[PDB]
Design a protein around this ligand. Structure first.
Ligand SMILES: Nc1nc2c(ncn2[C@@H]2O[C@H](COP(=O)(O)OP(=O)(O)OP(=O)(O)O)[C@@H](O)[C@H]2O)c(=O)[nH]1
Ligand SMILES: [Mg+2]
Lengths: 177, 415, 180, 18
């Protein structure tokens, strides 16, 4: 079971990797403590198919506080994914970076957040605005040091009304705390 | 300000959960079921629960309760709106809302939950727009979400340009047991199924009383809608300025406007019912229905629900027109009529037995509800005047609309 | 059983093979991988995590998994030891103080009972400064000849130029493949 | 045909109001 799943996930066949990811997602949703296999799924993370990348990101987010030490092997992957040409991939990476409740991981995510704050894609701008608020809620001092308040203020005075509304909501949430 | 959106089941098992902020532990869902059971068993059960410092505000779905945990002073209205949007999206994507699709459509369900809301703040709620970025069977997100028009995808092309409208009437009447009507409200519903090529900017025009008064024609039949709620595509500023209903219709069927005004006219159906219930011996149901509506209109599928005794058995019905059947599941006499011409008069004489032993507790008097549905009948008299379909390319639209009159909250209080 | 499909696949090339990319930080590992895959000297930030890529040459998919030289990432090299067939060691001849640390790390990684079939692959990186040693002084200092049951081969590759990469690839193919 | 009233074509605007 567990050994077979680990062997399937550590294989070079994408057809088996997708099935293993689906089984791991179902086990976690079915109520199975699958946090012990977090390091095994770490290697099978950089995948071209977006179907397995989303499941891996969701598992890491759900298995981030449980195994913060094993999450140190994803900063490079997040940095690499924060520059994908597809706006959806960048937005997903930004959302996953802010969702990871790791104290030693949010410190290194300031550079990708700063890069994506001025993203031309409105979805990327909204994702960066949400990630800034998430980081500020997780660490207000880190957000203040990164100087994201000035970027958030300029977001309201720009185009993309959805992005402007998202930035306004993030600023209100930050000021609320 | 929801902390974690989760989907429960009828047995207390969480079908799916999606944390949004992570400020609430995932183990608090276990106490939600005992708390709900205690509230229901004590009469204090409410959709907004509270597990100490964490509030569990959620609604009950067809098979599971969409409970969303929250800890801070989050907007309950925002949480309810997000839950309603999620339910609508699930209905649009999945034809059924049950546990059969929760355990079978998790691959797309998780992606939809992740994309819809981030950090407790939803960003996209259009099922049609969301279907172009998240599929269960991915390209870049469509520009409609990024653009201002997030409810009409550009580039839609069709062989023909036909738009079907539906002027659905809701006749709600609250008649007291004394015979007087207390709450008599009629809520209009302009539901249109727009199917055209491109992104036309519909210019809805009706014979509104306010519009007629402003134009100077406040002397003919004008609809006086007390409350008019336009859809997201309808521009609020245009309607507020000079009653200009200009909006881009969506691709599919959607509710554009929903009028809601009181009605001061006599009921379309007058029900005269009597209860000759003997003391544990027998019962009589002298129910007479008088149709006050126009004779040119026929009420298709008339269903006047008459609540009979719960313990009544061996009943006999002596009616005039229409099939009358007693359903033990509902414990009432279903006065089912297929076609009811306007001005018709149906008389019924019920007769059922009653056990000698009296019931342990009272059962109450459920109201008598009629299910009349007369199509091609506009009780409010509101008629569509024009529909300005304008397209940059230029095409000849063929709009269509139908008027349907039915019974809404048309309940009759029992004596 | 029938092996006709395997023979047909091997008639035009079937073996792919694997490879590893380990070494100290700022040792040309990321630049070397970029040159092998793309063919240009790409400047990249220090490898906080890891980089996985593949190289198609001689009908063999030479998959290279770059590993950073971070202190917190040094003990993470054991994760790549599972399902690993090759290993490439990148030395840092421009860091005299880091040479001892690199040698100690290589000795620690070479003292694993699970990593036994991985042949030695010493790459002389940063072969552009006059302070860089030859292909024998570094090997003599590291004692590559003292690795019993280990096939070690030292190759000097210039990060800016790229010379010697073809020779190293040919040597790796000859060590991995034992056919015509 | 269709239950609930046959669909009727709608106009373009108030032609009598210019
Ligand atoms: N100019 C120059 N620099 C070189 C050369 N060879 C190696 N370097 C240095 O080596 C570094 C290589 O770093 P990367 O290619 O990004 O990857 P890496 O070698 O694994 O370093 P880390 O990511 O920190 O582990 C560069 O930053 C260079 O400063 C070379 O031939 N010319
Ligand atoms: Mg590198």
């Amino acid at each position: 079971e567990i050994f077979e799943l680990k062997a399937e996930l550590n294989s070079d066949k994408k057809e088996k990797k997708k099935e293993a990811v689906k089984k791991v997602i179902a086990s976690m949703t079915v109520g199975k403590d699958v946090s012990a296999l977090f390091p095994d799924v770490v290697n099978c993370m950089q995948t071209d198919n977006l179907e397995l990348k989303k499941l891996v990101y969701l598992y890491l987010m759900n298995y981030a506080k449980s195994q913060p030490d094993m999450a140190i092997m994803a900063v490079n992957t997040f940095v690499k994914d924060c520059e994908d040409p597809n706006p959806l991939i960048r937005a997903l990476a930004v959302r996953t970076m802010g969702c990871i409740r790791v104290d030693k991981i949010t410190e290194y995510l300031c550079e990708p957040l700063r890069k994506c704050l001025k993203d031309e894609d409105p979805y990327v701008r909204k994702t960066a605005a949400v990630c800034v608020a998430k980081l500020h809620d997780i660490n207000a001092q880190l957000v203040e040091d990164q100087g994201f308040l000035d970027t958030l203020k300029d977001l309201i005075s720009d185009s993309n009304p959805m992005v402007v509304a998202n930035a306004v909501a993030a600023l209100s949430e930050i000021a609320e705390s | 300000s929801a902390s974690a959106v989760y989907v429960l089941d009828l047995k207390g098992k969480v079908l799916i959960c999606r944390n949004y902020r992570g400020d609430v532990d995932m183990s608090e869902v276990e106490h939600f079921m005992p708390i709900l059971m205690e509230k229901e068993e004590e009469g204090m059960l409410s959709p907004i629960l509270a597990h100490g410092g964490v509030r569990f505000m959620w609604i009950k779905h067809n098979n599971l309760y969409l409970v969303a945990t929250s800890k801070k002073n989050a907007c309950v209205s925002l949480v309810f709106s997000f839950l309603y949007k999620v339910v609508q999206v699930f209905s649009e994507y999945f034809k059924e809302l049950e546990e059969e699709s929760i355990r079978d459509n998790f691959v797309i369900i998780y992606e939809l939950l992740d994309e819809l809301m981030d950090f407790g703040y939803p960003q996209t709620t259009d099922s049609k727009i969301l279907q172009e970025y998240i599929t269960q069977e991915a390209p870049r997100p469509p520009a409609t979400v990024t653009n201002a028009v997030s409810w009409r995808s550009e580039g839609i092309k069709y062989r023909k340009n036909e738009v079907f409208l539906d002027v659905i009437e809701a006749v709600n009447l609250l008649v007291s047991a004394n015979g007087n009507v207390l709450r008599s409200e009629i809520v209009g519903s302009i539901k249109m199924r727009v199917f055209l090529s491109g992104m036309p900017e519909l210019r809805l025009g009706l014979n509104d009383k306010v519009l007629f008064d402003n134009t100077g024609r406040g002397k003919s039949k004008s609809v006086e809608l007390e409350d008019v709620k336009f859809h997201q595509c309808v521009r609020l500023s245009r309607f507020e300025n000079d009653r200009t209903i200009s909006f881009i219709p969506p691709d599919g069927e959607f509710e554009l406007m929903s009028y809601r005004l009181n009605t001061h006219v006599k009921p379309l159906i007058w029900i005269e019912s009597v209860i000759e219930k003997h003391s544990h011996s027998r019962i009589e149901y002298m129910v007479k229905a008088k149709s006050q509506f126009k004779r040119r209109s026929t009420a298709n599928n008339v269903e006047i629900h008459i609540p009979v005794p719960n313990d009544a058995d061996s009943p006999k019905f002596k009616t005039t027109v229409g099939s009358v059947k007693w359903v033990p599941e509902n414990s009432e006499i279903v006065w089912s009529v297929k076609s009811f011409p306007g001005g018709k008069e149906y008389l019924m004489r019920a007769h059922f037995g009653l056990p000698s032993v009296e019931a342990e507790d009272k059962e109450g008097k459920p109201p008598i509800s009629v299910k009349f549905e007369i199509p091609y009948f506009t009780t409010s008299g509101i008629q569509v005047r024009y529909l300005k379909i304008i397209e940059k390319s230029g095409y000849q639209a063929l709009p269509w609309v139908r008027y349907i009159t039915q019974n809404g909250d048309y309940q009759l209080r029992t004596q | 059983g029938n092996i006709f499909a395997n023979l047909f696949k091997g008639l035009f090339g079937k073996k792919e093979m694997r490879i590893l990319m380990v070494g100290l930080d700022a040792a040309g590992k990321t630049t070397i991988l970029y040159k092998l895959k793309l063919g240009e000297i790409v400047t990249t930030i220090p490898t906080i995590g890891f980089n996985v890529e593949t190289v198609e040459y001689k009908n063999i998919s030479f998959t290279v998994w770059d590993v950073g030289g971070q202190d917190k990432i040094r003990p993470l090299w054991r994760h790549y030891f599972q399902n690993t067939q090759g290993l490439i060691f990148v030395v840092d001849s421009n860091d005299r103080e880091r040479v001892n640390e690199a040698r100690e790390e290589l000795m620690r990684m070479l003292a694993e009972d699970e990593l036994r079939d991985a042949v030695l692959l010493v790459f002389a990186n940063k072969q552009d400064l006059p302070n860089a040693m030859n292909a024998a002084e570094i090997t003599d200092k590291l004692g590559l000849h003292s690795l019993r049951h280990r096939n070690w081969y030292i190759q000097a590759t210039c990060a800016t130029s790229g010379d010697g990469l073809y020779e190293g690839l040919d040597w790796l193919s000859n060590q991995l493949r034992n056919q015509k | 045909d269709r239950k609930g009233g046959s669909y009727s074509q709608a106009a373009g605007s108030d032609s009598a109001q210019s």
